[PDB]
Amino acid sequence: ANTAFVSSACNTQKIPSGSPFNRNLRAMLADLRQNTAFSGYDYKTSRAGSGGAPTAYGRATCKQSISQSDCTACLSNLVNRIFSICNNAIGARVQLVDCFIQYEQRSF
């Protein structure tokens, strides 16, 4: 399962420390993490915010040629890196070798 970095794009705008966004955001990334291998190696989902925070939309794809476990693995690898890559942003795309994730505060 190849998890080497390929490309990234980051919002100039960051999630405020403590922002309620953090929760539905993370909660959504796990839906991506757990379900893409089985929803066809490219999968989108969302999470409505509470307490004034926006809704969160994201998409995730795996290298078709990789396995379901290796698809689920890369995304986990990516989820714990996408915040660092983009310094806690209100939206982002990250491309690694075997898998892709994007998240934003609107629909895309």
Ligand X SMILES: OC[C@H]1O[C@H](O)[C@@H](O)[C@@H](O)[C@@H]1O
Annotated binding-site ranges for alpha-D-mannopyranose: 11, 93, 104
Q: Residue with CB nearest ligand X?
A: 91
58 binds ligand X (CB under 6 A): no
Residues 6+ apart with CB under 8 A from 51: 20
DSSP label at 49? -
**Annotated binding-site positions:** 11, 93, 104
Spatial distance between the Cα atoms of 84 and 98, rounded to a whole number of angstroms: 19
Instruction: Count residues binding ligand X (CB under 6 A).
Output: 7
Among the listed residues 102, 90, 78, 104, the one whose alpha carbon sits nearest the alpha carbon of residue 17? 90
Q: Among 1, 3, 11, 41, indicate the residue that binds ligand X (CB under 6 A).
A: 11
**Does position 82 bind ligand X by CB under 6 A?**
no
The binding site for ligand X (CB under 6 A) comprises: 9, 11, 91-93, 102, 104
